[PDB]
Amino acid sequence: MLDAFAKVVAQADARGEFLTNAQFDALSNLVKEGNKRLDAVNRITSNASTIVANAARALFAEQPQLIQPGGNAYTNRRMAACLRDMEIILRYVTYAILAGDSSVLDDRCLNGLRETYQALGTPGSSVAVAIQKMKDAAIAIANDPNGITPGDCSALMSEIAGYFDRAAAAVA
Amino acid sequence: MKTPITEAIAAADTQGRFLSNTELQAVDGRFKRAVASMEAARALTNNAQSLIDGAAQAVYQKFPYTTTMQGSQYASTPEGKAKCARDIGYYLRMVTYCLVAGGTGPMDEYLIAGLSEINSTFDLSPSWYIEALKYIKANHGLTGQAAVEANAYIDYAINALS
Ligand SMILES: *[C@@H](C)[C@H]1/C(=C/c2[nH]c(/C=C3N=C(/C=C4\NC(=O)C(CC)=C4C)C(C)=C\3CCC(=O)O)c(CCC(=O)O)c2C)NC(=O)[C@@H]1C
Ligand SMILES: *[C@H](C)[C@H]1/C(=C/c2[nH]c(/C=C3N=C(/C=C4\NC(=O)C(CC)=C4C)C(C)=C\3CCC(=O)O)c(CCC(=O)O)c2C)NC(=O)[C@@H]1C
Ligand SMILES: *[C@H](C)[C@H]1/C(=C/c2[nH]c(/C=C3N=C(/C=C4\NC(=O)C(CC)=C4C)C(C)=C\3CCC(=O)O)c(CCC(=O)O)c2C)NC(=O)[C@@H]1C
Incomplete structure (x- = not known):
């Protein structure tokens, strides 16, 4: 790493x-610039369950076939696996943010993930959408001006977006 | 590679969890220390050639037989002196890298792993490299915590040779 x-x-x-x-x-x-990175990690970590749940709700409102019977997220076992996958990806993204490098995310999460979903029949493009929804939510939370000292986090938010985009591209 | 930041990530990953507050505080501490540590790394880098050259002579003056004993493993020849100056450069580079990364990882991975086997197989005396190290510690001209951070990685290298 x-x-x-x-x-x-x-x-x-x-x-x-x-x-x-x-x-x-x-x-x-x-x-x-390190204080800003720590805030991003702290904020995203502290709101992780919210980021996952709302991104999942959004995914399934947009792709209802996933939750029809026979769909890849139908049954609570498959839904729970899907939610777990969203949280896993988000966890490794927060590691990449702390590190300022994608290696941990690439090596321990993304490598082989496309093939894993192909073998399962999990549609990777749907996972990419889930990831992109988490991206938007995580960045709105990390870049929220309320309750933080004013300053420019735009370079860091772009870096953060790139980790999410890299994860989505790995399964898309 | 071991750094304070990857150690924190590895601990969280081992337990399948998000980073803890104590792990973020550890990275904050690394960022606070990075100031003087990077100061030392730039200083050593900017004066590396003087330190390498001077360190080479320090070794030969301490161990004059390396000047003249026939053999591959000696600075006997111009190629032996090249190899020795090279190696000294390697050690100095590794100290700069530790200072840059905030811990011993770069030297652990690129130099210390296998060191005892290399010195044994190639008939290289560790005392040679320790003398080189002591000369860098006394002549890098740093003070305050930049010198503290630097001399920590220097002593760490001397220990691995002991
Ligand atoms: C972009 C992310 C938003 C933003 C960030 C921002 N934060 C600060 C200043 C500080 N951030 C912290 C946070 C921590 N320090 C730690 O050791 C830890 C781990 C436990 C954390 C989470 C701290 C202590 C500071 C300094 C004190 C303070 O609150 O001011 C700044 C100011 C500049 C700086 O780098 O110090 C900024 C800009 N501010 C925004 O408006 C973005 C929405
Ligand atoms: C959720 C948005 C989508 C979805 C997800 C889904 N995933 C699985 C099964 C697995 N997911 C993984 C992923 C990982 N395990 C790891 O340890 C890591 C990081 C190291 C990752 C990224 C794996 C390995 C599996 C199979 C093994 C396991 O279940 O633990 C499922 C279950 C598949 C099944 O048929 O049982 C599901 C449903 N499905 C969707 O529809 C979403 C688009
Ligand atoms: C200088 C203090 C004395 C000296 C130097 C000398 N070294 C070698 C040959 C080798 N040196 C190394 C050291 C490293 N290789 C690495 O990758 C790293 C970490 C980045 C280190 C520290 C190694 C592995 C060798 C053997 C392989 C090689 O040739 O590169 C020699 C030549 C040995 C030979 O038999 O040809 C010499 C002369 N000898 C002295 O007398 C100086 C006091």
Whole structure:
């Protein structure tokens, strides 16, 4: 697993090189902006059950065939597996946010996930939609100006969006 | 790779759970420490060649036989001196990487794993590399906690050679 710092170190080590000033500057900026990253992780983590439930309700309002009998989310066992999958993906995304690198999400969650759903008959495009709904909810929560010190989190929200988008693309 | 941030993630993942408040506080602490630690890494990087060159001489002055004993494993020859300067550069680079990442992981993974086997197989004396390390610790010219963070990873390397 890599965080943003280890990624830069690994890239540098493969070339046998000390860090450049551009790399130092990028990592120092990540540190200086660190409080915002911690808030995003904290806020999304603290609201995770809400993000999952509302994204699931939205998914099934939009794709009612999933909850018709015979649909992939019909029976409480399959519905519970689906909700669990949404929470798993969200959990690994919060790890990527803390790390500032997608490696943990790629290696421990996304790798092989498309094939897993194909083998099950779970439609990956529906999982991608669930993920995108969680994205929008997580970012509205993480970027909410209420009860937080005013400042610009837009670069971080784009980074967060990219992790969600990368997860959706992995199953789409 | 072990860092304070990946350690926190790994603990949460091991238990299938979201990150705890105590894990976020651990990353905050890493961010607070990163300031001086990255200061040291830039300083060492900017003066690396002087430190490498000076460290090479420190070793030869402490162990003059490495100057003249015939053998691959000696700085006997110009290629031996190249290999030795290279290795010293490797150790310094690893210290910069630990300072950048906030812990020992880069040196654990890229240098310490297998170190004893490499030094044994290739007839390389650990004392050689310890002397190089002591010279870097005394001549990097850092102070305050930048020197604290740096000398921690230096001592850590000396210990792995002991
Ligand atoms: C974007 C995410 C929104 C935003 C973020 C923002 N936060 C701060 C300042 C702080 N954030 C924290 C949070 C933590 N510190 C920790 O150690 C932990 C783990 C337990 C957390 C969650 C803290 C302590 C601060 C400093 C004190 C404070 O509340 O001001 C800022 C200010 C700038 C900075 O980086 O310090 C900002 C901008 N603000 C917004 O408007 C976004 C919606
Ligand atoms: C929910 C939006 C959609 C859905 C989900 C669904 N998933 C499964 C079964 C499994 N899901 C996984 C995924 C993971 N397990 C892990 O450990 C990890 C990370 C390491 C992931 C990403 C796996 C492995 C399975 C099979 C094994 C298991 O169930 O534990 C199901 C059940 C399939 C069945 O027929 O029993 C379902 C329903 N279905 C939908 O319709 C949503 C689009
Ligand atoms: C300098 C203190 C003394 C010295 C140096 C010397 N080293 C070698 C050969 C090797 N050095 C290493 C060290 C590393 N390889 C790595 O990947 C890492 C971590 C990034 C380290 C620390 C290794 C593995 C070798 C063997 C493989 C190689 O040749 O690269 C030599 C040559 C040994 C030989 O028999 O050809 C020398 C001379 N010798 C002295 O006398 C200096 C005091």
